[PDB]
Amino acid sequence: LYFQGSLRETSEGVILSVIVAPNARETKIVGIDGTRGRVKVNVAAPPVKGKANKELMKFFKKLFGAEVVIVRGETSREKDLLIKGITKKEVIEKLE
Ligand SMILES: [Cl-]
Ligand code: NA
């Protein structure tokens, strides 16, 4: 997997662009959507009541060891996550 099309480094940190597939057995990175420039993430939650947002952010805060917030897409499948205070190098190392 090449994650460089799904990330950009901003003033505040790194914006990781994902597309969520809900209702999964396990939350996990499964591939790259190159048409969207987004990481495909299976999410073990239903897509109701913010449960997929909660699971998604829990999984990524654990992975990066950084504050993760949804900056765009709270009610979309295509969510942009700001990982505050981190470089793109560090995020790519963690995604790999
Ligand atoms: Cl910027
Ligand atoms: Na949700």
Curated annotation (Swiss-Prot):
InterPro entries, alphabetized: DUF167 (IPR003746), YggU-like_sf (IPR036591)
UniProt superkingdom: Archaea
Gene3D superfamilies membership: YggU-like (3.30.1200.10)
Annotated GO CC locations: cytoplasm
Residues that span the membrane, as ranges: none
UniProt record similarity statement: Belongs to the UPF0235 family.
Protein name: UPF0235 protein PF1765
Protein source organism: Pyrococcus furiosus (strain ATCC 43587 / DSM 3638 / JCM 8422 / Vc1)
Taxonomic classification: Archaea, Methanobacteriati, Methanobacteriota, Thermococci, Thermococcales
